Amino acid sequence: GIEYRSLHTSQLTLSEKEALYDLLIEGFEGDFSHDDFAHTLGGMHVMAFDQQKLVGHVAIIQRHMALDNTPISVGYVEAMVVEQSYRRQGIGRQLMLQTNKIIASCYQLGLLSASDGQKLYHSVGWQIWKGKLFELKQGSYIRSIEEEGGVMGWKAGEVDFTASLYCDFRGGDQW
Amino acid sequence: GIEYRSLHTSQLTLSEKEALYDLLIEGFEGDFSHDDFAHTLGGMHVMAFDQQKLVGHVAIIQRHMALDNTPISVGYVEAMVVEQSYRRQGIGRQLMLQTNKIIASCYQLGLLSASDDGQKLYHSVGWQIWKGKLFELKQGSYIRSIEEEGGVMGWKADGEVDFTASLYCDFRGGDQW
Numbered sequence: 235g236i237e238y239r240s241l242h243t244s245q246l247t248l249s250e251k252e253a254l255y256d257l258l259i260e261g262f263e264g265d266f267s268h269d270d271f272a273h274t275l276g277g278m279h280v281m282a283f284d285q286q287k288l289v290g291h292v293a294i295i296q297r298h299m300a301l302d303n304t305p306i307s308v309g310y311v312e313a314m315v316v317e318q319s320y321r322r323q324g325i326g327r328q329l330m331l332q333t334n335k336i337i338a339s340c341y342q343l344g345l346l347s348a349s350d351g352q353k354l355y356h357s358v359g360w361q362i363w364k365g366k367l368f369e370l371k372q373g374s375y376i377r378s379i380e381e382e383g384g385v386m387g388w389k390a391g392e393v394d395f396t397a398s399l400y401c402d403f404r405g406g407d408q409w
Numbered sequence: 410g411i412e413y414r415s416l417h418t419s420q421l422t423l424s425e426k427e428a429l430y431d432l433l434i435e436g437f438e439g440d441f442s443h444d445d446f447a448h449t450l451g452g453m454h455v456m457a458f459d460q461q462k463l464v465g466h467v468a469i470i471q472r473h474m475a476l477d478n479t480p481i482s483v484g485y486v487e488a489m490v491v492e493q494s495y496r497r498q499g500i501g502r503q504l505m506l507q508t509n510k511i512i513a514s515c516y517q518l519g520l521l522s523a524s525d526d527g528q529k530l531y532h533s534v535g536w537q538i539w540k541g542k543l544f545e546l547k548q549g550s551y552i553r554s555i556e557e558e559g560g561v562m563g564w565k566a567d568g569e570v571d572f573t574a575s576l577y578c579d580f581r582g583g584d585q586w
């Protein structure tokens with residue numbers, strides 16, 4: 235009974251972006267910052283609607299990383315949420331099926347940082363990243379020690395999940 | 410008589426993808442590489458059609474950069490082309506006007522790397538030569554992009570960006586800019 239629409243950020247109205255912010259604030263219970271919202275904008279949104287009420291969301295944003303020393307185009311998953319009373323009905327899974335298709339069509343690798351939410355991602359093919367993770371700090375890479383074990387990856391061309399990943403720079407949490 | 414469509418890479422038919430590749434090889438007279446084509450995929454396409462024939466294209470790719478020490482979200486312009494016989498009719502201008510709207514709605518700053526045929530057109534829709542230092546990752550360490558300094562141009566909707574500040578781009582294959 236849910237309707238799914240895939241829209242680029244550039245195709246959203248101000249009120250649709252506001253409804254997205256509202257859904258994220260309510261669904262994360264205070265764990266979602268302004269930086270997290272900036273991270274949600276600029277790529278593709280998969281949105282779940284009950285009639286006209288936005289009830290679920292996930293975004294896929296392009297990131298430009300290194301896998302060891304090789305450049306890799308990444309589809310990075312952000313702001314995955316389903317309104318509380320709509321949970322445990324398969325909406326999050328449909329969001330991820332749609333997310334996988336977008337990634338397969340556009341990028342060499344899907345990545346995300348997971349809560350927990352890890353089991354849902356595993357059920358649609360994602361695996362824990364086994365290599366070391368690095369982020370830019372003051373223009374120089376350092377270990378993302380806190381995120382290791384939490385980042386998951388998905389490939390439809392095969393990628394070595396034991397290799398090191400070097401993400402690109404942003405505000406807030408780099409992963 | 411030209412129709413414009415804005416489509417994400419994920420919304421493109423396979424037909425349009427192959428048409429795009431041929432259009433770029435034909436339009437660039439030999440200096441459009443496989444890495445250049447990879448750089449074109451993953452973001453928004455603005456496509457111009459004459460009836461059913463694709464005649465013009467520009468892509469806007471999300472990039473994550475540093476402006477001095479500050480993280481900035483970039484709409485990076487790639488793979489700007491109009492088929493030879495359609496040029497000098499304003500199609501490229503319309504492509505950029507559509508590009509400007511996408512950038513304004515999504516990113517903090519527009520950036521591109523221009524040519525001879527490009528600069529004046531981009532300037533005509535508000536873009537300015539980037540005056541600051543440019544840097545790219547080599548072996549995980551930033552170095553100056555001397556080659557590209559003076560050729561990269563930027564665009565800001567509100568217009569409040571220090572065009573003399575340094576830019577550090579994110580990593581990719583082929584040309585980083």
Ligand SMILES: CC(C)(COP(=O)(O)OP(=O)(O)OC[C@H]1O[C@@H](n2cnc3c(N)ncnc32)[C@H](O)[C@@H]1OP(=O)(O)O)[C@@H](O)C(=O)NCCC(=O)NCCS
Pocket residue numbers: 261262313314315316317320321322323324325326327328347348349350351352353354357
């Ligand atoms: C994570 C989240 C998006 C999942 O949304 P969801 O719609 O509940 O996802 P699904 O319903 O597809 O799967 C949820 C669970 O319900 C189960 N489920 C689905 N349909 C079901 C049914 N008909 N009967 C019983 N259980 C069912 C699934 O098997 C899954 O169980 P698992 O998590 O043990 O695999 C949601 O919990 C959420 O918004 N959390 C807060 C935001 C957040 O943490 N986001 C970051 C996640 S990294």
Ligand SMILES: CC(C)(COP(=O)(O)OP(=O)(O)OC[C@H]1O[C@@H](n2cnc3c(N)ncnc32)[C@H](O)[C@@H]1OP(=O)(O)O)[C@@H](O)C(=O)NCCC(=O)NCCS
Pocket residue numbers: 436437489490491492495496497498499500501502503522523524526527528529530
């Ligand atoms: C750059 C490019 C895309 C421009 O496409 P275009 O459709 O010719 O862009 P426009 O028609 O809007 O403007 C092009 C020129 O025609 C002029 N022009 C605009 N409207 C015109 C009209 N109605 N009648 C005649 N000339 C016109 C513009 O002022 C510009 O002149 P300039 O070169 O002096 O600025 C095209 O040359 C091209 O495909 N080049 C090959 C690939 C390439 O190099 N792309 C640029 C990489 S930066």
Ligand SMILES: CCN[C@@H]1C[C@H](N)[C@@H](O[C@H]2OC(CN)=CC[C@H]2NC(C)=O)[C@H](O)[C@H]1O[C@H]1OC[C@](C)(O)[C@@H](NC)[C@H]1O
Pocket residue numbers: 262265266267270311312313314315346347348349380381384407409
């Ligand atoms: C130090 C923070 N690190 C991780 C950062 C990630 N941006 C975050 O992404 C989710 O949350 C929000 C809001 N904040 C944004 C996007 C969300 N992701 C998706 C797919 O929608 C992770 O959620 C954070 O991980 C923490 O939470 C889980 C955990 C297991 O308890 C810890 N892992 C050691 C903890 O570090």
Ligand SMILES: CCN[C@@H]1C[C@H](N)[C@@H](O[C@H]2OC(CN)=CC[C@H]2NC(C)=O)[C@H](O)[C@H]1O[C@H]1OC[C@](C)(O)[C@@H](NC)[C@H]1O
Pocket residue numbers: 437440441442445486487488489490521522523524525556557558560584586
């Ligand atoms: C060493 C190459 N450096 C620049 C790299 C840029 N990826 C390139 O972008 C355009 O072309 C192509 C195909 N290759 C891809 C996308 C195009 N851009 C747009 C908006 O569609 C620049 O075109 C290159 O610049 C060269 O050309 C111009 C010049 C002034 O003569 C020289 N000096 C800077 C020369 O370096």
